[PDB]
From a paper:
α-Actinin-2 (ACTN2) is the only muscle isoform of α-actinin expressed in cardiac muscle. All four isoforms of α-actinin consist of an N-terminal actin binding domain (ABD) comprising two calponin homology (CH) domains, connected via a flexible linker, which allows for conformational flexibility in the ABDs, to a rod domain. Thus ACTN2 is important in cross-linking actin and titin filaments in the Z-disc. We have investigated the effects of two mutations identified from HCM patients, A119T and G111V, on the secondary and tertiary structure of a purified actin binding domain (ABD) of ACTN2 by circular dichroism and X-ray crystallography, and show small but distinct changes for both mutations.
The original family reported to have an association of the A119T mutation with HCM, had a variable phenotype, with some patients only developing heart failure at the age of 75, and others showing heart failure at ages 36–44. The ABD was in the ‘closed’ conformation in all the structures, as found for other structures of the ABDs for the second striated muscle isoform ACTN3, and the two non-muscle isoforms ACTN1. However, although continuous densities are observed for the loop region at residues 110–120 in both the WT and the A119T mutant structure, this region is disordered for G111V mutant between residues 112 and 117. For both the WT and A119T mutant structure, Val112 is orientated towards the interior of the molecule packing the side chain into a hydrophobic region. G111V lies just outside one of the three stretches of amino acid residues thought to mediate actin binding (residues 41–50, 116–140 and 145–165, reviewed in) and A119T lies within one of these stretches. A119T is within the binding region itself, and its alterations to the structure may be expected to have a small effect on binding. The A119T mutation has an intermediate effect with Tm (60.8°C) only slightly less than WT. The Kd was increased ∼2-fold for the A119T mutant, and ∼1.2-fold for the G111V mutant constructs compared with the WT ABD.
Author numbering: 34 to 112, 117 to 257
Amino acid sequence: PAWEKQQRKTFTAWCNSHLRKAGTQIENIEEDFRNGLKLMLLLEVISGERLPKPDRGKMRFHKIANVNKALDYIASKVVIGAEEIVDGNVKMTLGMIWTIILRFAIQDISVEETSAKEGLLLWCQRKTAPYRNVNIQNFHTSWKDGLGLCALIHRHRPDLIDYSKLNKDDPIGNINLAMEIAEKHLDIPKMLDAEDIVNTPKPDERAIMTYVSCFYHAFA
């Protein structure tokens, strides 16, 4: 049930990490993409392609037309109705944004003949190989104690963190410490809530994949 809250936080932070490059931000993902304008902008920033010109009209049919420019573009890149987005359907909006994250942050990742989600997982497993207290098997329970994230940072930037000093006792601090370092030194905004991750039996993998993908791109 806490999945919506986790996706809202993380997907909003991810969107904002890109929209800032176009001079704007969103705040409330359940309403701020209704008119399609910032959704089109997001797609342009992350794809590097131009979309058709937006319609700044205020009525429903103007919004449908903008949202279609976005959905039709997405459909051209990936192997839902505009009304769902224009009507502020929360589940469908989060689903649409996951589609975008998966396509533009994750799909093109390729490591050892392994692509997309599976490729990002293999990369994480390769980079955390040296750490005996880490066992990445998935994008949920494997990341709960914060050591995985800390290890990703240490593997590339041992100047930024003393990994030996860490252990499983303080998962909340482990997660926050990684996020603080990433924000301060890797230009990666904080996209998770440490409390939610630790206190949920199975954290939301879409949220975790989103954040972890930012580390992949920072270090590539």
